[PDB]
Amino acid sequence: MSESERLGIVRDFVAREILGREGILDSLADAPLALYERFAETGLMNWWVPKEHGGLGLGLEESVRIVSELAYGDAGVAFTLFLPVLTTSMIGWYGSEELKERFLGPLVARRGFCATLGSEHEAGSELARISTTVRRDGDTLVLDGTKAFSTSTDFARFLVVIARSADDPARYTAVTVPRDAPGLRVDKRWDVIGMRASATYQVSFSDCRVPGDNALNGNGLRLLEIGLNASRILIAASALGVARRIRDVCMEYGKTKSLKGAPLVKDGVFAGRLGQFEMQIDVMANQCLAAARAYDATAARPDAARVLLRQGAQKSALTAKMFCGQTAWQIASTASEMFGGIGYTHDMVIGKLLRDVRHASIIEGGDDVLRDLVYQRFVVPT
Amino acid sequence: MSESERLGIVRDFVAREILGREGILDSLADAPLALYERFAETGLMNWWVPKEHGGLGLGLEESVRIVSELAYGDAGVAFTLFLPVLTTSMIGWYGSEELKERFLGPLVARRGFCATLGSEHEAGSELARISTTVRRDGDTLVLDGTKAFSTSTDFARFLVVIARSADDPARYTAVTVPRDAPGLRVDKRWDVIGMRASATYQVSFSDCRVPGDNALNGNGLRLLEIGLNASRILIAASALGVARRIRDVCMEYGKTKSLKGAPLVKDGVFAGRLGQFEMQIDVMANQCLAAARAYDATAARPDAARVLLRQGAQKSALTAKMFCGQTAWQIASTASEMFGGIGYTHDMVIGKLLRDVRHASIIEGGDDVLRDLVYQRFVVPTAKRTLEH
Amino acid sequence: MSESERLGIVRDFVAREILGREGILDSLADAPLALYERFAETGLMNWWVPKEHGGLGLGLEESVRIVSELAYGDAGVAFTLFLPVLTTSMIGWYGSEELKERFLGPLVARRGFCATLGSEHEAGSELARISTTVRRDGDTLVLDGTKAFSTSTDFARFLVVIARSADDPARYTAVTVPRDAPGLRVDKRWDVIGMRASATYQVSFSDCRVPGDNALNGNGLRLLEIGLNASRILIAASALGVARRIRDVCMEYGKTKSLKGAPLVKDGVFAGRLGQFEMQIDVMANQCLAAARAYDATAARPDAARVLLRQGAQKSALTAKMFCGQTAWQIASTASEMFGGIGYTHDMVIGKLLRDVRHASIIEGGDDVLRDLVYQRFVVPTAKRTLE
Amino acid sequence: MSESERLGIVRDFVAREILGREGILDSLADAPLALYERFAETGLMNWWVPKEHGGLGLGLEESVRIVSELAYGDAGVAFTLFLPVLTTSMIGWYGSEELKERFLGPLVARRGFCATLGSEHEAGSELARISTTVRRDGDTLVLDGTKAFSTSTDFARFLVVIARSADDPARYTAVTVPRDAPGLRVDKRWDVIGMRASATYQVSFSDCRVPGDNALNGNGLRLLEIGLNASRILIAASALGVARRIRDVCMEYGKTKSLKGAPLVKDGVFAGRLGQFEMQIDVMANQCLAAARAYDATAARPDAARVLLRQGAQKSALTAKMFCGQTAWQIASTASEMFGGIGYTHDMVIGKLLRDVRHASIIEGGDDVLRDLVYQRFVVPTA
Numbered sequence A: 001m002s003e004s005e006r007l008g009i010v011r012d013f014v015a016r017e018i019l020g021r022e023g024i025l026d027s028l029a030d031a032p033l034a035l036y037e038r039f040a041e042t043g044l045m046n047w048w049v050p051k052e053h054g055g056l057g058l059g060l061e062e063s064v065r066i067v068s069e070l071a072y073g074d075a076g077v078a079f080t081l082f083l084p085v086l087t088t089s090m091i092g093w094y095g096s097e098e099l100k101e102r103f104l105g106p107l108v109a110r111r112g113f114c115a116t117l118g119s120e121h122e123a124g125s126e127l128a129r130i131s132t133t134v135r136r137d138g139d140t141l142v143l144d145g146t147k148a149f150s151t152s153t154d155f156a157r158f159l160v161v162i163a164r165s166a167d168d169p170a171r172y173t174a175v176t177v178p179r180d181a182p183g184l185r186v187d188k189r190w191d192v193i194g195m196r197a198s199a200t201y202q203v204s205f206s207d208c209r210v211p212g213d214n215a216l217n218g219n220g221l222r223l224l225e226i227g228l229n230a231s232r233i234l235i236a237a238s239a240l241g242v243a244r245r246i247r248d249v250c251m252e253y254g255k256t257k258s259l260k261g262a263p264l265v266k267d268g269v270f271a272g273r274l275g276q277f278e279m280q281i282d283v284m285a286n287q288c289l290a291a292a293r294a295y296d297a298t299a300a301r302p303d304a305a306r307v308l309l310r311q312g313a314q315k316s317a318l319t320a321k322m323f324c325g326q327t328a329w330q331i332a333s334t335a336s337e338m339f340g341g342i343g344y345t346h347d348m349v350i351g352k353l354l355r356d357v358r359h360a361s362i363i364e365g366g367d368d369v370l371r372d373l374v375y376q377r378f379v380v381p382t
Numbered sequence B: 001m002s003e004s005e006r007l008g009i010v011r012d013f014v015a016r017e018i019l020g021r022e023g024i025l026d027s028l029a030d031a032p033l034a035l036y037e038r039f040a041e042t043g044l045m046n047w048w049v050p051k052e053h054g055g056l057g058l059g060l061e062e063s064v065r066i067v068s069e070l071a072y073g074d075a076g077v078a079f080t081l082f083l084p085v086l087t088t089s090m091i092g093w094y095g096s097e098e099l100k101e102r103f104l105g106p107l108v109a110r111r112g113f114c115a116t117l118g119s120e121h122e123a124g125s126e127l128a129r130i131s132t133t134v135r136r137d138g139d140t141l142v143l144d145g146t147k148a149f150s151t152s153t154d155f156a157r158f159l160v161v162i163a164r165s166a167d168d169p170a171r172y173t174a175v176t177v178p179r180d181a182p183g184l185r186v187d188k189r190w191d192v193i194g195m196r197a198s199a200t201y202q203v204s205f206s207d208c209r210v211p212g213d214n215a216l217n218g219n220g221l222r223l224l225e226i227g228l229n230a231s232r233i234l235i236a237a238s239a240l241g242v243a244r245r246i247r248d249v250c251m252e253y254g255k256t257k258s259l260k261g262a263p264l265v266k267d268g269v270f271a272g273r274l275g276q277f278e279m280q281i282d283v284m285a286n287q288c289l290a291a292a293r294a295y296d297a298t299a300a301r302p303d304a305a306r307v308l309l310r311q312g313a314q315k316s317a318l319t320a321k322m323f324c325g326q327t328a329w330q331i332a333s334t335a336s337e338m339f340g341g342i343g344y345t346h347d348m349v350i351g352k353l354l355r356d357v358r359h360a361s362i363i364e365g366g367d368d369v370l371r372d373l374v375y376q377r378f379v380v381p382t383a384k385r386t387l388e389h
Numbered sequence C: 001m002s003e004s005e006r007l008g009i010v011r012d013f014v015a016r017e018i019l020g021r022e023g024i025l026d027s028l029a030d031a032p033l034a035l036y037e038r039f040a041e042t043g044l045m046n047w048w049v050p051k052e053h054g055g056l057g058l059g060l061e062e063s064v065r066i067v068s069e070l071a072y073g074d075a076g077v078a079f080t081l082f083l084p085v086l087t088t089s090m091i092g093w094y095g096s097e098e099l100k101e102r103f104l105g106p107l108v109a110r111r112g113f114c115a116t117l118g119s120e121h122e123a124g125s126e127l128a129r130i131s132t133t134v135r136r137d138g139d140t141l142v143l144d145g146t147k148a149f150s151t152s153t154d155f156a157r158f159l160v161v162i163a164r165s166a167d168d169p170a171r172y173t174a175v176t177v178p179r180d181a182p183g184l185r186v187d188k189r190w191d192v193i194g195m196r197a198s199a200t201y202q203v204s205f206s207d208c209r210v211p212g213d214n215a216l217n218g219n220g221l222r223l224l225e226i227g228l229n230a231s232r233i234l235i236a237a238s239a240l241g242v243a244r245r246i247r248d249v250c251m252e253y254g255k256t257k258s259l260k261g262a263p264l265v266k267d268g269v270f271a272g273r274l275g276q277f278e279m280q281i282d283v284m285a286n287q288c289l290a291a292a293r294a295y296d297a298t299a300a301r302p303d304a305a306r307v308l309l310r311q312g313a314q315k316s317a318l319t320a321k322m323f324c325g326q327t328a329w330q331i332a333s334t335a336s337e338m339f340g341g342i343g344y345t346h347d348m349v350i351g352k353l354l355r356d357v358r359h360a361s362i363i364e365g366g367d368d369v370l371r372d373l374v375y376q377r378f379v380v381p382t383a384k385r386t387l388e
Numbered sequence D: 001m002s003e004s005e006r007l008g009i010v011r012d013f014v015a016r017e018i019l020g021r022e023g024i025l026d027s028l029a030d031a032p033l034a035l036y037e038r039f040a041e042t043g044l045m046n047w048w049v050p051k052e053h054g055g056l057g058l059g060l061e062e063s064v065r066i067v068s069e070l071a072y073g074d075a076g077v078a079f080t081l082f083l084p085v086l087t088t089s090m091i092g093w094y095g096s097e098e099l100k101e102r103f104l105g106p107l108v109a110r111r112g113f114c115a116t117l118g119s120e121h122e123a124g125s126e127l128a129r130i131s132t133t134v135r136r137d138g139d140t141l142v143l144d145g146t147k148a149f150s151t152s153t154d155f156a157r158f159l160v161v162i163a164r165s166a167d168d169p170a171r172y173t174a175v176t177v178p179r180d181a182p183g184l185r186v187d188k189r190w191d192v193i194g195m196r197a198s199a200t201y202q203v204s205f206s207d208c209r210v211p212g213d214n215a216l217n218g219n220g221l222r223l224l225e226i227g228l229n230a231s232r233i234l235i236a237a238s239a240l241g242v243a244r245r246i247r248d249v250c251m252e253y254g255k256t257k258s259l260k261g262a263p264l265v266k267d268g269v270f271a272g273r274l275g276q277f278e279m280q281i282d283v284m285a286n287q288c289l290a291a292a293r294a295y296d297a298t299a300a301r302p303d304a305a306r307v308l309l310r311q312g313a314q315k316s317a318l319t320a321k322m323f324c325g326q327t328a329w330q331i332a333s334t335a336s337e338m339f340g341g342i343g344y345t346h347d348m349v350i351g352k353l354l355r356d357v358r359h360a361s362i363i364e365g366g367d368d369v370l371r372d373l374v375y376q377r378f379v380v381p382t383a
Ligand SMILES: Cc1cc2c(cc1C)N(C[C@H](O)[C@H](O)[C@H](O)COP(=O)(O)OP(=O)(O)OC[C@H]1O[C@@H](n3cnc4c(N)ncnc43)[C@H](O)[C@@H]1O)c1[nH]c(=O)[nH]c(=O)c1N2
Pocket: A083, A115, A116, A117, A118, A119, A120, A121, A123, A124, A125, A126, A149, A150, A151, A192, A195, A200, A362, A363, A364, A365, A366, A368, A369, A372, B257, B259, B267, B269, B270, B337, B338, B339, B340, B341, B342, B344, B345, D268
């Protein structure tokens, strides 16, 4: 199947299961929504997983296009569908071959979800301070602690938990945990203000025991940073998709709205806003594609796992999320006033799109964290 | 009671009835919420209505402070409680003595709401194009048409409707209508994204008959512009109140959030944001008060109704709502990213405050409409006369 | 005469001596320009100095209107003419009666300038770290050190220098120094990017000796903060004046520029920008007037000097300079693109007005300094109190 | 000659002839400055001209890197050196072989400048209203009219003038004119507020006669739009280079400025600003490269001239100039306040860089014009 044919399948899924269903998608309905099963039936679930595990092995450049099309429909749906790339990419590069086969093989075959548990309430983004601990006890690993936010965990097949070693407090380990391990408790689902088609949870571990072979190889904080390269780029692509939707929603309104005796699409102030939007969308698209191409070129190296350990955070993954999160938010903010009073009602979608797009600058590192990281890694040394 | 004790009563009301009860206020609950009757128990309902019409006669300058305090708790509650100033000010200035005694005379003692119906879907802000018509039938006026948005109408005691005459080339008339006039239908309540403690309705008229004496005296679109001077200033005051709440929510979060081994209130980036917020709040407050003082000075003139026909839209009422609506949105927008992931949840109030404060730049004229009005009314005539000219 | 007649005199001065003379004012010519002596002849120099010293004693509210009219013509001319209020207000409240008669009397009668020397290179705005010292030597004070920027000093009658005592753990003192004091050296004039009708200097002291009675009474850094209340409000009023000029320059251009077959003043995008400008000018004006009225109400109190030591920096003086500096810069930035290519030449004044208005957010404390000061003085203590 | 080697030559030229010389560069000195002859001596003048006319034939992608390096030193020097691409690309695609041999050949070998005269005062960007006229007189063309702004004209070898046909008012023609043609008058040099190492002129024509074959083939307004694809992308690349310089000036100041007991490079507000600048520079770079790569792919087609007549303005050329002009101005605006009082003096370069970068959003179409063009061409039709 061609790349163009796959994108048409995604576009038909959006038109068929998302567009016109903003009501249910924005309702924080019992998870998972049936539409996720419908996406499974496309054959495109986990589309990035390598062919060695029965996946399609699609590159991140193609993923940018897929995610932009999904998020045009609903950013919470796109998020839920691409975010497992964070977990699978960490397992792909730093798990043993037997661990990869135990978890990734079934993930693809069963059309399932997985999740990564990094965030904690008190540590915040200062991840050296995380308090979730992992202890060796014979042939098992023992997890204890509370993890603040993780998406899809309740219906995931397995999780990767970033933990600090109690044995050596200077050591951090990523630990694979199956969903129904003893001692794993889903504490609650968060009442998110947007992306309300996604489900995000607080999770607690108390004497949670898993086999010793379940740890990934490497500093868990460095592995997390590497896994976030893919998800940060696709969060940027999601913001691009919402901005495209906002543009199209403005044009649909402008065709029928009258001002000064003509459709609003003929008005100079409106034209100026939409031309600025289109410029911004063009730049966001080129930035996402540049970042994805760089990601794919590195992942194609036969030594990619070792190369990525040296690299850590990819500069253009950080800058793509920063730029697209800021720009799509600014587009939504402008458009939130372009529909008069009806734009202040749920009869128009712009209110939802604005809440949805707000996630991009917040999740996986806010812009204070990421500005500092870009500065320390790519300005100070240069 | 002093002005200071009245504001203490308003603050106590917000503390007792609004703060901590944000869930019900954001729920679009069946209207009117019981808290509006509880506000009437303070003695402050319709606080601006002149002494000559049975009210406390508080000035708009004091109203700015009252609204700011109410909106600090909830902008939709504030909005519901001050918006009738638009209606009562038009009737007080331009209604006949008989009409004023019939509708304004009892309003304060009844603790009643009233509403103004200007907006329409097809006309937009081009109200010269309104399609709600008023036709004369002997000593009676007959209304027909659909009005797009009006706040509190369902539980209001009476309304003022802006209509175009069906008997004249281009004549506009403000017509007073009791809530239960036959022919008046409340079509639906709007599912608003914020201010969900306020209730706003679409309303239709079919052969709705009222006495000819129910028409206010004057060009109805000019009367509406004059009435909007007060509500535009108080919308600005509401945005100021929400901005003060956002500042305080940031400080409360910063006291217990840790960064680099110390509370966030010690961080330089945080301090910079809050110092900027405080500057913007100070500027908003001085603009609202300046606009209100100017309004009060005109309204105290003995010929105020005649003066206001000549003046029309007050420049600083327009610029107050423009500035405060923009600034408070910018503050909420900045603050929406200052709480990390928990700020993306309903565990924090910022998401609600962002939806609430968004109303200020939209309602009673968006900023494209208001920039053009300021330009045409004040910039163009001035440009004739400048030292650079 | 009346306040309106006074403002007409200022407007006439601007129309006759400033407007149309962009080239000379922007040239960093030998200072002071002759137009300053022309202004002296109006009888309005040092218009704020109290009548007890021969001055007109005009309030800061009126000063806002005067300065905005001057700055409409040229922000550097306005700056040069109002900035001595920083120095004279400190001397007026915290100098001895003898010191006030020795310096303020002649300043008015002789139509002179004076300056305040606070800023230093190494200390920056962290003026607790200033390295300019003052040492007692019997009944005389001895000053040593380098001061970074001070306006009009070379042709000023006298200065007030903020110094750190060499005889105390941490004592700061404001010291009056006559221009002809031996040991006072004007190192150089700064080649400023805008306000090139003003002259600002680096100044050094070496064994510069003055009588002990030349010291003002009080913590020198607090006195400075109090003196800056007036000058910060008037910097705000200057930015307001420049914003008014930018609005008017846009309207004059728009009347004769054609677009889509009609004057640009009929265009919707233009109307929106100018409506936004006018909103911002109105808000700036009301902020400046509020700050000035609060300043005037405090200064009218019989115990004003004592009250001001307790109050220090005035919240609305800081917020006025912050707001007007940011807003006038935003207006100039927008306008710098509104004239097409001719706007990128000296045939239009917008390039100069942009450079001129840039001063307002930089001078007398940048916005990083001022946001932090507003935060520490007004946000942190009131967070002890709030309904939430 | 590797590409990295060529870029090293450019960087060495910037270090030798530009850095530390802001005084002279900002002074609107007698033009052309001697440094342009020094650039000619590198062998890189007119580096984009195809090898068919003796040029190096470098693509626009490499040109983006070259211009960014030049503009890092001085945007006005960069502008003067790359802007002839507008003129040469028009002649290359729409001139006859004889015209190309007559004007493009010698341009490369003689290391000269050429210029395009499009803008007019009364027409503004409403170019259908241009009033400069061209009339046929036998086998010759007669030009009459005043052109508002043209860069390097006084020392150019030749010009392309956009004119309206006096015979058929519906027709627009691009006409090549030798600099020394009788009837061509350089009226004045504009006193520009920035890029004061460049020279831009008002030019008038009175009975200016040239051979008929000096005309390019095609609608002159469409040809101008096509030529502007390259120059608009390189204006964006110039703004990028100035933004990189501003970042570096901030870092050099922050290393020696003290704040709360530590160098300013340790301060959180400063780090936030510079991290934001670096993100914006990365995005600008990737947008310029994407636009240049699309330009190069189209220019490499055998039928490029025909393809480009259909295409007209390239979307990503417009969006690159729009984005980079806005972003680099915003960076300059923020930095103009980051140096305290010394930043308000000519002891610091930020004042000049601010004036320099201001050109990018203004020249070759302001953003009101370009937002409307992007809207009409790329938003409205895509139903
Ligand atoms: C819907 C949804 C979905 C998910 C998640 C959250 C949400 C809301 N997350 C967690 C999310 O990625 C996380 O919330 C963000 O990275 C932000 O980190 P914190 O909330 O800890 O705030 P954090 O502590 O980083 O920042 C909070 C505030 O503190 C200030 N601050 C922080 N750093 C600063 C600095 N350097 N300088 C100045 N100020 C600074 C700022 O005001 C900032 O807004 C997650 N997690 C996970 O592990 N797996 C998952 O699947 C998901 N998915």
